[PDB]
Symmetry: C4
């Protein structure tokens, strides 16, 4: 309709996106000031008043979108479902008001395309995250049984062991703080710890390198799908078939010159 | 035979794989609860009873596979030999029961293909792991001779030195904890330590980047060999010959247009 | 003109570049000696005299360039504008004299091309640096509200929280030094900290891997643009179109052999 | 000659390489045992006797090579010049006997090809290592002037500052150990330190990623030059010209079909 077109063309404009962006920055700025313990009683009501003013602008913005696109059209996008929940949770009877700043990711398209590539990369590294989980669990059980009676603060139970093993994987005070003290009581503790470090830092790097490389390609390819309007063959698919394609055109040229030979 | 076909088609099904998967998760879960020092005497017999129930299911599962595939056919796979040893060791007269959870890697195909790529990548980095070993040995000998008489807790013998040099390579308390104390007695100790850190962190990164990049390619190529049923030319082989192949087709086209020129 | 050509051909020579290079190294060397608190009163006047001698050589060098290239021609380059400001600030009525050594980057072409590639790579990672900023701000606000009353030295205000969260992201004493003490008072603090570490170290790596890979390509391509004198298609553009280009030449060859078929 | 051919064909054999390899491992093993402070007086003469036995085998091995290849032919290789110096220094009137184990790199071909790729990669990263040097020098001068009077143990002079800044770059105790203490006296010290960390860890990663990627390609290409007997076009050269080459063959095919069109 006419009204469901003037409103939709306003929502898609960069001026509307900029206004909503400024309101999200204002909301985070006042929630930042609200961390000041030394504030006046009047300053707090004034800042929380600006928080309500921000939140009610988002309600008008979400309603504008639901009217302009429809219920099926608006809730079709996952980013719009996220936007809705962020705003709708503020009306549900909470130190997590600052999570409202996460809307900067969904409202700024370049930021939305960066996080999107990372989210789409996650399924690809599912097996590596599972492999790291298995290694942490087997290690936490072993550490609890081996060192829990002598080192209860660190390996007292499975939870204590999982936390310590995470600390050890991040290399934080692993030797001076954990393994050298454990070694005064258990001299061969390095046989557990050193291989654990080698195996976990390798797997974490594989997990991070994987997400980074896949998010880089997924983003680049979605950028090209947006530009050409058609499906982009993943770079690995092109790379796997590069040889196959190259030697097919060589055979076509040898057969091509065989026909020219008889002339 | 008929019976050696109904059984083999059950073993290959996703329902059988899921049941075995759930039994491996149950086994790890009860071994996890068995780390509770405050458990009842009855709770322990009950949990260890569930451990026997899990292990006897694996015995029936392994026997099903040896009947369905044969001794040569079953022990042909390296993953099946691993599965066998994990179960067979439990009957050999041991805090390493939790290692039974490693079966999640061999039973879940995606996980099996992740670890497989890493294992196949290891020979390629053999020279770098040897280079890092040589650097650690030469360094441990030097550190023992230089600092062992004044710093016996850290460089007292070769074993103490290897452990400290590993701690130093992981950058854990290397300066405040080891090198600043060593420097009060030996002012030029940084001439040993700083180059050691530079050389070892570079080589470890090379070792890890190597395993990660090769495991990524080996996996991608095995996935394509499974899909096409034929050998996949490694990406580096395609990359090395890309120029050679491209200019061969240029020469073929120049010769092709020379034949067309006379027409 | 004649004089505006003998001077410009001297400025572009490698002997002039080497002389200016040696004067920049001399300037840094005397500013290095000037950090000696135990120096003589005469040694300081002697060293600062060498500093004036260095700076006045740069004034003659900049003036030579402004005469040889013109005001529009000299200030057209961004590296020349930088050179000018470094020298002109020394005449403006300052422990930042050592920043004069940054001129080694602008005067040595290989160094200038390394920093240039990094600067040109920065816009590409703008969204990731913004994403890391958003995560740090949301986290600093949450940390101030959660732990500021019980841990005022570390999370007392937003500034204290931002600094501690940066320390935690660099993994420096994050557990033994910050999170284990916070956990005696707040047992579930690891629910905030562990996900914060996972999310920030991933994003920082993405930011650094991005700058490094883009600077590597931008440099390689600018080197080729200098060699060929024409625009170089970015590697990603070539990679995205590799499939498209390869199958277009296959169709051209199938159509080519269809014409030869009728002969 | 006949004798200068039986000897050269022995030197190139894998049995001779294996024997020399075992003697290098024996030499390192006895130098390792010689770090035992609790040894007998007789054990030391016995071990040092094995050291002379090892070293005299290397003298016969080097002489065999100089006779078989000639002075110009033997000293033509850089690896042979290294081998010579390692052995010849042992006869020059020294805790650096363990450096004799470095011969394992030059005698084992796969190890020799790994280190060679790294050495050939170093010139390519010369500008980045210079950039990191400039950043460390400018930073050391600033730190000495800013914090040397209040923190003399860490920033007392330029040498103390360079060591502390290296510790800070490796993130070792940078905050709890150095910057939080510096901040009690100088509240804005984080303005120096935090940007220094960001800039140096980025540049070190660039330096290491560069050496690793170039050593990986240089090795792969030298392996292919050994296999084909001809110069291998660097992968980046192939990548830069991939577009140029692909569209040249498209134009050749359009011109090719124009000739077929008139038939
Ligand atoms: C170009 C996008 C992509 C993808 C992808 C394709 C479709 C949907 C989502 C992601 C990808 C990710 C993982 C994967 O395999 C996991 C095991 N591997 C270790 C083999 C195979 C392909 C990818 C990214 C970078 C390089 C190569 C592929
Ligand atoms: C595609 C798989 C592969 C392999 C590979 C081939 C057959 C069996 C197993 C592994 C590889 C690994 C190492 C190698 O050379 C070691 C020295 N180099 C430093 C040259 C050469 C090739 C490889 C993986 C990623 C990139 C390039 C090659
Ligand atoms: C070859 C130079 C280049 C560039 C570049 C092009 C023009 C000017 C400046 C930089 C680049 C950088 C970022 C970018 O997209 C950001 C999101 N991405 C995650 C998709 C797309 C292209 C680039 C560098 C390395 C690999 C790929 C591209
Ligand atoms: C394939 C070997 C090679 C080389 C190389 C060529 C000849 C002799 C020695 C090394 C290389 C190294 C550095 C370089 O440029 C430095 C600036 N760059 C940032 C542009 C350009 C080429 C190289 C290695 C990996 C990828 C690309 C090139
Ligand atoms: C992928 C890695 C996943 C790591 C998971 C960590 C779980 C941590 C649970 C836990 O330990 N606690 C929360 C339950 O209350 C108790 C803590 O308060 C704390 O006291 C202990 O963690 C320390 O004493 C152990 O060294
Ligand atoms: C690739 C890296 C390989 C590192 C290999 C480490 C070997 C460690 C052997 C060892 O040191 N001990 C086990 C033998 O009993 C003794 C320990 O119990 C402990 O006391 C000492 O390690 C410390 O005192 C040294 O700072
Ligand atoms: C991208 C990351 C950006 C991090 C930004 C850090 C801002 C730090 C500002 C600040 O904290 N101070 C400067 C203002 O004077 C005060 C300091 O002097 C110091 O005392 C405190 O930082 C500590 O007490 C906190 O643990
Ligand atoms: C690329 C990075 C290059 C770093 C270069 C480090 C030079 C270190 C020289 C030096 O400091 N000393 C050797 C000269 O004798 C003195 C030491 O013995 C020691 O006491 C001091 O380093 C500490 O007090 C400083 O915190
Ligand atoms: Na660290
Ligand atoms: Na520490
Ligand atoms: Na650390």
């Amino acid at each position: 309709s006419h009204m469901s077109r003037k409103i939709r063309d306003l929502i898609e404009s960069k001026r509307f996106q900029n206004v909503i962006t400024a309101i999200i920055v204002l909301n985070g700025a006042v929630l930042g000031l609200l961390t000041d313990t030394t504030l006046s009683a009047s300053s707090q009501n004034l800042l929380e008043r600006v928080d309500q003013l921000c939140l009610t602008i988002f309600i008008v913005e979400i309603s504008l979108k639901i009217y302009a696109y429809g219920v099926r059209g608006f809730f079709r996008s996952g980013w719009n479902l996220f936007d809705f929940v962020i705003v709708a949770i503020a009306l549900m009877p909470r130190t997590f008001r600052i999570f409202r700043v996460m809307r900067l990711v969904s409202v700024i398209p370049t930021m939305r395309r960066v996080v999107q590539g990372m989210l789409l990369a996650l399924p690809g590294v599912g097996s590596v995250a599972a492999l790291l989980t298995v290694v942490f669990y087997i290690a936490a059980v072993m550490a609890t049984n081996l060192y829990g009676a002598t080192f209860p603060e660190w390996f007292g139970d499975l939870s204590k062991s999982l936390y310590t093993l995470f600390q050890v994987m991040t290399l934080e005070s692993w030797s001076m703080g954990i393994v050298r003290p454990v070694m005064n009581v258990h001299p061969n503790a390095w046989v557990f710890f050193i291989p654990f470090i080698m195996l976990t830092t390798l797997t974490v790097l594989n997990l991070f390198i994987g997400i980074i490389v896949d998010a880089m390609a997924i983003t680049k390819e979605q950028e090209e799908e947006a530009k050409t309007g058609h499906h982009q063959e993943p770079i690995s698919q092109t790379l796997l078939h590069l040889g196959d394609r190259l030697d097919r055109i060589e055979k076509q040229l040898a057969q091509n010159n065989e026909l020219l030979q008889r002339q």
